[PDB]
Design a protein around this ligand. Structure first.
Ligand code: HEM
Ligand code: HEM
Lengths: 726, 726
């Protein structure tokens, strides 16, 4: 026995707040959390306690510390079959990462609709409010490798596998409502442009390099999703606090055969929230696993990620009623024109057991639809349908990837396909072809119908010649970027200007910067001028005279495009740092922890060393991390309770911790003699909105802090932060 | 006509300093730098200019912007074989990364010995000072993925493929002289323990987590290489400023058949230099590609990485004359006991053309030796011999990986091996077996001999029973950790204590931290007390009374084990940030820039925006980056010239630039009114060692700065920095 006698090696199998217990595989942390898919994986879960160590052939091993050798200082012998199996398996551990979205984090959960949608769709998972569909969801960045950092500036993926009773449906979306390009033929060009450059394989996780901006300057259709990327949408706080979108128009098909166009939305019930760029960039260094960690720890705490599925629905007869093409995936459908109808709720409530087996090997593909859905001719969706099956057979080693446990349907699947590498299913059917008489033609085709029917495509009319040509209706590139720009708050605009300015400053060939600023002048002259000033570029008179693009169907703005213009804050699952001293005022700590607990906000107790400190009343406080070990970047607000403030008053790291949190617009709360830290961040005696201060930490102090936290950041401080050296 | 008319898109094909021109493929940047391997790759180099765009079957493409569809808003057709080939290739771009050392950066170069070594080895590449051997070198970290960050705390790999006239020799070493474990059977255990933990796949690029320190606390053989990783050896400034080691004792065999034991070394001719931890961790966020970038741009500037190969040589009769076993890879051979004899010089002077083709697909394996070398029974080396071929056939898709152009020998290769995936060579031999008469038995075996002979193993005597048993001679774990600790300067010892303290602070189970501190108490009580103090742990009286381990062969230190105890600084290829203002004193800038140029030190001119500023006298100064764009993390020293200081005096980024550089112990030089920045970093009016200050940048100001730069960092400043909020 190498475990400690006290049992402290094993985390409690109950919900616990971040940092309170070591994290664990999902089935051991939350063994009572079940759904049909989770249960179905029991055939392949493998335990360990009380079992002997063996080879993969079942032979017990006596000595797992040594190779077999001729004498104990002799050569290793070829007959050591136990060493060679162990080292061969290790030698073959890695598989290819995904070509894009290689970096991602996943969890299990469940979905149910609010009401039956049978009037618009015959899909079975949308038919009954009390029929629950398991899901597995992977969130991702796009450009970086599987070992890249989480809080980069990038688009994020949001892929949901729904294990329905009529097949797997994969809704493979991103966190912005449009993509960069119009036709899948260009996907390798765009991805190669954004990815590390091919001579030296730099930069990882960043679009701030010449080839990406070269492509953008030469392909104005990219500008819309570039605007989203350069805004704070490119730097979410958490995968719990971003939107999701399917991007393409799809179809819903009901039992009477009617097609309705649909775009898919996920609304985060925790609200929309993003980092600021200096925080995000520094956090890729202090904790490159911040989003993976925060997601796993939110589910271990019971702060399950919840999202509302929503549909924008457009009747068939209204296909051409907008000033943009519904099938153009560089155009969004403004919610002021077509509202999102609430459809159902998805809750992620258990982490996987083994990241490689369940997350790395999962395969999501947007051609996996079910009866009641269909595609459209969007030319980027069309080409996606070829790529996901093709790449998943390369990455997962052959055509039986649907038999890898995470990807298996929970509903029946039977057909005449056979063989392939690592075939697990042993078919007993005498026939491997149809039509057959020798098995009375089973398994059999099923006619389409209202429920449980075979799939039939909606009989869309196709009229045209065989052409490689872009629809002229797709040839407008600046109106949607402008609508997005005008819908942002002033601080969000400033952050967009700063994102383009920072990125193009890293473009070494100056003419590319100039060409991008010329594109920006076709969107908005105020944006283009503000970027140009930061680049040392002066717009020409012709640039100053470019006519702005038209409004989008009369809209001058749509506030649903902003992260912050409409309040939607939720503090449950956020975290505060509490900076301890060696004689903390216990009464402050009581009041602080009670008010945080009432709102579901977690706390991390920090100090200048690890171990414990004792409060004024004898209470022994364990320290979660040092001020340098868990920087302000990792929390949403900072509280300094009273005590022996002289202990930490001259500590550089405690002072910096407040300066960094202040620069990054976080609420700060100072009780009693902790108000002496007002001098590090230059707060006048009268106080400042976003700094909470009082003689002690009481009801009123904590309510004011929590109100600031519900607004996420203190935007009004922005003019005060350029002078702080942090 | 998408290129600019001024031709500024294309970098000059001449050596240029970092940042001055976009980087490019080696054969375009330095077409006239040649060696036999680089010439032999011409058969597969593919150009582009003036050629038509084609499918891989040579069919010209007319429209690479669109898929083929029935109507320009219609569905994509299956007959579009141009789209399908392009998206199929994209879908299968990735291959598995290396199981370990997945993150690496490589270059081409050449090796020449200083004199013939025919007395001690018949290896042909060491036989003649005029014999030049091409090399390809890959430097790497160990734990993180290919998309992880460069300036992590980790061991570094240093692998050299020598393309000799008698076969490929791969010298596959690391940047510390020992490894963590003694027997290859344990390598999957140790690697699994340091790699991201299996439930959640965190943390990337870090050993600061519970499973690593759990394994270390239960396997004290790891403590010697852990000491090296916790020292600043774990965070090199550049691959140019670290040492290399083969680790194992190997053999040299001369023409008379005499075996000499050898351990291999590489000495960096640029000196040894490392970062400090807060700088390295931050730099993983601000530039995760910093080491890859620095190596590439050193080569493009002519600052070619140079290393001296050196041998520690032990006669066969002296195998048992040390307190440690020569075959134990957790033990070093102190240079005070066995000096390194200089053997030759390697210069890396050309970057690859295509990172994937040449770096990602390169395969190095320490079983690739040539006649004149041999192995020993080191039980870690013996198990490596199985792993490398096994893993490379999985990673590179089959057993013909030696036909991938970068891995091909430059000498002849002919045998009776056939077929396999991806077979390039078309064999015309009538026979595919020997002995044969049908091809007169060619190709033929060759007897061993002094030159151009066949390989024969040295006939070492083996005697013992078949056992899975560790040699008792390997059962000593604390003397070499202690020798290392006692050989470090006081500031190096502080940084070791801070490394263990930071890492064990991130171990969530406190009993593991206690167990590690108990192991430190077996190495050195001062080390163990200082780490325990930072963890809030008190040593027991039993721990206070553990007797230290013995000295190693009478040594109580060996200064060659320190980075800094013996000055070896070289400033060429280093870089200085120059913080501009909008009216710089041009005389200061003339003096600063030409002084740096004379010593081969590069400069980056920084400001608060991109573009230009104008000096007092009209000189137009182009700006390389903003203060936030190119943080002090990325430079070795900071110079602030006189001029209009009020322009930048209240710029929080300019101030913080100097605070970060000051905290990280970098030299800082302030001319004229730039001395007003003394107050930002709290420098006495009377000044302090490490801050250069004068009325102007003339006289001795640049010599004083350059002297500071040759000592790397200002260690005496360490007690001054805990107080600084930065
Ligand atoms: C609306 C535009 C797109 C969206 C929203 C989208 C979204 C995503 C997401 C979220 C993933 C990762 C799924 C996971 O977590 O495993 C992914 C993977 C992938 N995507 Fe797409 N993507 C789009 C366009 C395309 C296009 C145009 C192509 C190629 C024609 C493509 C090819 C791929 C490939 C090859 C993978 C890797 C899939 C795997 O290995 O399993 N994507 N995409
Ligand atoms: C002295 C101890 C060792 C040193 C110095 C060492 C050094 C290295 C280096 C430098 C690389 C990267 C080569 C490159 O740049 O591609 C590498 C890769 C590798 N090492 Fe070792 N290694 C050690 C021990 C081991 C052991 C004990 C095993 C297994 C028994 C092992 C298995 C591997 C594997 C599987 C790879 C990836 C090779 C590839 O995919 O091409 N290593 N090692």
């Amino acid at each position: 026995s190498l475990a400690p006698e006290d049992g402290s090696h094993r985390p409690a199998a109950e919900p616990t707040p971040p940092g309170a217990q070591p994290t664990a595989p999902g089935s051991l942390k939350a063994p009572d959390t079940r759904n049909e898919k989770l249960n179905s994986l029991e055939d392949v879960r493998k335990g360990s306690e009380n079992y002997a160590l063996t080879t993969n052939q079942g032979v017990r091993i006596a000595d797992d510390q040594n190779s077999l050798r001729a004498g104990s200082r002799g050569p290793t012998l070829l007959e050591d079959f136990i060493l060679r199996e162990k080292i061969a398996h290790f030698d073959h551990e890695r598989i290819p990462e995904r070509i894009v979205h290689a970096r991602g984090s996943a969890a299990h959960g469940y979905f149910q609709p609010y009401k039956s949608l049978s009037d618009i769709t015959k899909a079975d998972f949308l038919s009954d409010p009390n029929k629950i569909t398991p899901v597995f969801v992977r969130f991702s960045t796009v450009q970086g490798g599987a070992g890249s950092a989480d809080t980069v500036r990038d688009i994020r993926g949001f892929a949901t596998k729904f294990y329905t009773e009529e097949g797997i449906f994969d809704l493979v979306g991103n966190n912005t409502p449009i993509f960069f390009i119009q036709d899948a033929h260009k996907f390798p060009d765009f991805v190669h442009a954004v990815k590390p450059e091919p001579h030296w394989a730099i930069p990882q996780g960043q679009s701030a390099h010449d080839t990406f901006w070269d492509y953008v300057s030469l392909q104005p259709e990219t500008l819309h999703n570039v605007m989203w990327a350069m805004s704070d949408r490119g730097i979410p706080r958490s995968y719990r606090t971003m939107e999701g979108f399917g991007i393409h128009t799809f179809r819903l098909i009901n039992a009477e055969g009617k097609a309705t166009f649909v775009r898919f939305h996920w609304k985060p019930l925790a609200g929309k929230a993003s980092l600021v760029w200096d925080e995000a960039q520094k956090l890729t260094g202090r904790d490159p696993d911040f989003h993976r960690r925060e997601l796993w720890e939110a589910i271990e705490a019971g702060d399950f990620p919840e999202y509302e599925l929503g549909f924008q629905l457009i009747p068939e007869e209204d296909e051409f009623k907008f000033d943009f093409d519904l099938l153009d995936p560089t155009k969004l459908i403004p919610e002021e024109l077509v509202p999102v109808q609430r459809v159902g709720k998805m809750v992620l409530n258990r982490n996987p057991d083994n990241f490689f087996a369940e997350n790395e090997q999962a395969a999501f593909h947007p051609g996996h639809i079910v009866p009641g859905l269909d595609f459209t001719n969007d030319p980027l969706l069309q080409g996606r349908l070829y790529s996901y099956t093709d790449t998943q057979i390369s990455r997962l080693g052959g055509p039986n990837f649907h038999e890898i446990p995470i990807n298996r349907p929970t509903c029946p699947y039977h057909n005449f396909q056979r063989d392939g590498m690592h075939r697990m299913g042993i078919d007993t059917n005498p026939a491997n072809y149809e039509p057959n008489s020798i098995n009375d033609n089973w398994p059999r085709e099923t006619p389409p119908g209202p429920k449980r029917g075979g799939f039939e495509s909606y009989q869309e009319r196709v009229e045209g010649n065989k052409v490689r040509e872009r629809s002229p209706s797709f040839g407008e590139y600046y109106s949607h970027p402008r609508l997005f720009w005008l819908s942002q708050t002033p601080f969000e605009q400033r952050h967009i200007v700063d994102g383009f300015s920072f990125e193009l400053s890293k473009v070494v060939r100056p003419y590319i910067r100039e060409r991008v600023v010329d594109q920006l002048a076709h969107i908005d002259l105020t944006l283009a001028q503000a970027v140009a000033k930061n680049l040392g570029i002066e717009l020409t008179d012709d640039q100053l005279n470019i006519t702005p693009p038209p409004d989008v169907n009369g809209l001058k703005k749509d506030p649903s495009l902003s992260l912050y213009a409409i309040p939607d804050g939720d503090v449950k699952g956020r975290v505060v740092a509490i900076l301890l001293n060696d004689e903390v005022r216990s009464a402050d700590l009581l009041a602080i922890l009670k008010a945080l607990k009432a709102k579901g906000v977690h706390a991390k107790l920090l100090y200048s060393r690890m171990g414990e400190v004792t409060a004024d009343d004898g209470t022994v406080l364990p320290i979660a991390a040092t001020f340098a070990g868990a920087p302000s970047l990792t929390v949403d607000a900072v509280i300094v309770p009273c005590g022996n403030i002289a202990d930490i008053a001259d500590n550089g790291d405690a002072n910096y911790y407040l300066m960094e949190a202040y620069k990054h617009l976080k609420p700060i709360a100072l009780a009693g003699d902790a108000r002496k830290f007002k001098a590090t961040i230059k707060i006048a005696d009268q106080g400042e909105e976003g700094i909470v201060e009082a003689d002690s930490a009481d009801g009123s102090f904590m309510d004011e802090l929590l109100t600031l936290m519900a607004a996420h950041r203190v935007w009004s401080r922005i003019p005060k932060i350029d002078k702080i050296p942090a």
